[PDB]
Structure 1
Amino acid sequence: SVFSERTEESSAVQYFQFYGYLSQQQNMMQDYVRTGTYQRAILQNHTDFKDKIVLDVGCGSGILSFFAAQAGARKIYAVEASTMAQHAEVLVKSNNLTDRIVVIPGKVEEVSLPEQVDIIISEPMGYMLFNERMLESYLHAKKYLKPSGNMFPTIGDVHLAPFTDEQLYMEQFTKANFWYQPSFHGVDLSALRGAAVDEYFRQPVVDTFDIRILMAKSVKYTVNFLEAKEGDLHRIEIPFKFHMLHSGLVHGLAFWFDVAFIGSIMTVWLSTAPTEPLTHWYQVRCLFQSPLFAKAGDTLSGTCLLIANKRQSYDISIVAQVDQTGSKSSNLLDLKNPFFRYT
């Protein structure tokens, strides 16, 4: 299948085992911004669902399928590959919706649906939008979508902006400096110091922050889920040119995302921006191994390149340069294994 061809079995087992836990579903369901905004997007656009055929990609517990039912959908095919599919069935029965919600266990790339659908609903967004590579499963499912069909969410915006945060930088650098010791219990570790710094700075930092640490207006990269093909997400190149609003040390790039549900009645936005109420997606920051100094008015240019790997994530290459001075920084980050810092 398309899924297995792009996915290490080891990664898939772990991935679907994770979403098989009810405690994990609870955590997502209790993100009221997420759950409430999804419900608002669906119900406020009930005409896009009323008497329509629906596909829910990765239905989990089934909550989005239930929203579609509340909106009057004639039939909802709810696809889920983890064992959570069993629990969704339980809820469909106990909520007397067996006549409209049909759970189909399996990967959306592998199952067979009885008919084409009018609209696909899903929550395929991971950290920094692209983590988990579930967007590709979402786009893949368009093979079941009618020509006049819609997608909820319809588009995704990735925002990136330069930030200054000495404390975060020193916090990570301090960890790596363990490997700087010349005599840990009499053992010289210093030879691995380079490898250590490399390893720690490879971790994106997931948490939230004050918007005042941002040093320039964000750059936006848009994915149109109605137009995009699976293959478009294998290599994502995001060029940027920031016009620095403040002077100081740039310690890296901050990331967040918005998705829009573009319905017939209204467009509803779900935002994970630091200016908005916090979600379980928080925000993501990629540190430079060495900060770049820039003055207000300078331009910070470069590229954020995401290369999809078989562990359902991306290898992230960030190259940034202060155009006026030629000060350049590079880093490779592994989006699969971020550092969860929020407390």
Structure 2
Amino acid sequence: SVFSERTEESSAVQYFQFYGYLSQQQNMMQDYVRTGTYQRAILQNHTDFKDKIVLDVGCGSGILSFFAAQAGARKIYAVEASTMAQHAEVLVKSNNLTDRIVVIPGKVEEVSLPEQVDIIISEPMGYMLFNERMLESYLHAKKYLKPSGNMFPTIGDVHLAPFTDEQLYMEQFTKANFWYQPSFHGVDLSALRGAAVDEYFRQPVVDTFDIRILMAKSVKYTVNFLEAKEGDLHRIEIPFKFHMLHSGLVHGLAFWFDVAFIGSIMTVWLSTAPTEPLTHWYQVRCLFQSPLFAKAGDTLSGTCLLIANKRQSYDISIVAQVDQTGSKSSNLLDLKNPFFRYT
């Protein structure tokens, strides 16, 4: 299948085991911004669901499918590849919706549906949107979508902005400098200090922050889920050009994302921006190996290149320069192993 060809089995096993836990479903369902906005988006656009045929990709506990039922859907095909599919069936039975909701255990790339659907629903967004690469399953499912069909969410926006955070940057060296000592119980560790620094800088930092650390207006990269193909996400190039609001040192790029549910009645936004209430996605920061100095008005230009890997994630390559000085910097990060720094 398409899934098995882009995923190393070792990764797939752990991925679906992780989602078999009810504790994980609970944690996600307890994010009201997530749960609430989806319900609102579906219910306030009931004309997109009323007596329609619905596909739920990675339904988990099946919460989204129930929302589709509340909106008046005729039939909902809820697909789940983990063992959470068992528990989903239980809830459909106990909620007496066995006649409208059909739980299909398996991967959406492998199962077969009896008919085309009017709309696909899913919550495939990971850290800075693309983590988990589930967006590709979401786009793959479009093979079951009528040419008239819609998708919730309809679009995805990733936001990039440069930040200054001296404490975050110094932290990496404070920790790595553990290795910079000549006699740890008689052992000179200093030779591994360089390797420790690199390791720490390869980790995207997941937490939140005061919006005042952002030094320029954000750049936006949009994915239209109605137009995009699976292969469009294997390699995501995000050029950027930041016009600096304040003079100072830039220690890296901060990331967040929005998704919009563009229904017939109204558009509903789900935002994980630092200006909005915190969500379980938090925000993501990628440090530069060397800070770049830029005075206000200067231009910080470069490329953020996301390369998909077999571990259901992305290799992040960032290159940036100050146009006026030629001062340059880069970094390579592994989005699969982020550092969770939130209190």
Deviation at 1:179, TM superposition (A): 2.2
Task: Between 291-300 and 172-181, report the one with greater CA deviation.
Answer: 172-181
Deviation at 1:63, TM superposition (A): 0.3
Q: Which SS does the other structure have where 1:82 is aligned?
A: coil
Separation of aligned partners in 2, 1:83 and 1:248? 51
Deviation sequence 1:178-201 (CA, Å, 0-9, x none)? 222222212122222221111110
Separation of aligned partners in 1, 2:282 and 2:167? 19
Q: 1:94 is matched with which residue? A: 94
Deviation sequence 1:20-51 (CA, Å, 0-9, x none)? 00000000000000000000000000000001
Separation of aligned partners in 2, 1:177 and 1:11? 32
Separation of aligned partners in 2, 1:323 and 1:47? 50
Deviation sequence 1:5-31 (CA, Å, 0-9, x none)? 000100000000001000000000000
Q: 2:62 is matched with which residue? A: 62
Q: Which SS does the other structure have where 2:307 is aligned?
A: strand
Separation of aligned partners in 1, 2:306 and 2:177? 28
Task: Between 77-86 and 166-175, report the one with greater CA deviation.
Answer: 166-175
Separation of aligned partners in 2, 1:170 and 1:258? 30
Separation of aligned partners in 1, 2:173 and 2:71? 51
Deviation at 1:340, TM superposition (A): 0.7
Equivalent positions of 1:144-159 (< 5 A) are: 144-159=144-159
Q: Structure 1 residue 315 and structure 2 residue 315: aligned?
A: yes
Q: Which SS does the other structure have where 2:178 is aligned?
A: helix
Q: Which SS does the other structure have where 1:172 is aligned?
A: helix
TM-score, structure 1 normalization = 0.99
Separation of aligned partners in 1, 2:39 and 2:198? 42
Separation of aligned partners in 2, 1:179 and 1:302? 33
Percent sequence identity over aligned pairs: 100
Deviation at 1:177, TM superposition (A): 1.6
Deviation sequence 1:44-89 (CA, Å, 0-9, x none)? 0000000100000000000000000000000000000000000010
Deviation at 1:127, TM superposition (A): 0.2
Separation of aligned partners in 2, 1:161 and 1:325? 20
Aligned residues: 343
Q: 1:280 is matched with which residue? A: 280
Deviation at 1:277, TM superposition (A): 0.5
Separation of aligned partners in 1, 2:177 and 2:58? 42
Alignment root-mean-square deviation, CA:
0.6
Deviation sequence 1:199-255 (CA, Å, 0-9, x none)? 110000000000000000000000000000000000000000000000111010000
Deviation at 1:288, TM superposition (A): 1.0
Equivalent positions of 1:95-244 (< 5 A) are: 95-244=95-244
Separation of aligned partners in 1, 2:334 and 2:28? 23
Give the gaps of 5 or more residues in structure 1.
none
Give the gaps of 5 or more residues in structure 2.
none
Deviation sequence 1:84-132 (CA, Å, 0-9, x none)? 0000101000001000011000000011111110000000000000000
Q: 1:26 is matched with which residue? A: 26
Deviation at 1:173, TM superposition (A): 2.0
Separation of aligned partners in 2, 1:323 and 1:192? 34
Separation of aligned partners in 1, 2:195 and 2:321? 24
Task: Between 130-139 and 171-180, report the one with greater CA deviation.
Answer: 171-180
Separation of aligned partners in 1, 2:75 and 2:179? 58
Q: Which runs of 4+ in 1 moved over 4 A?
A: none
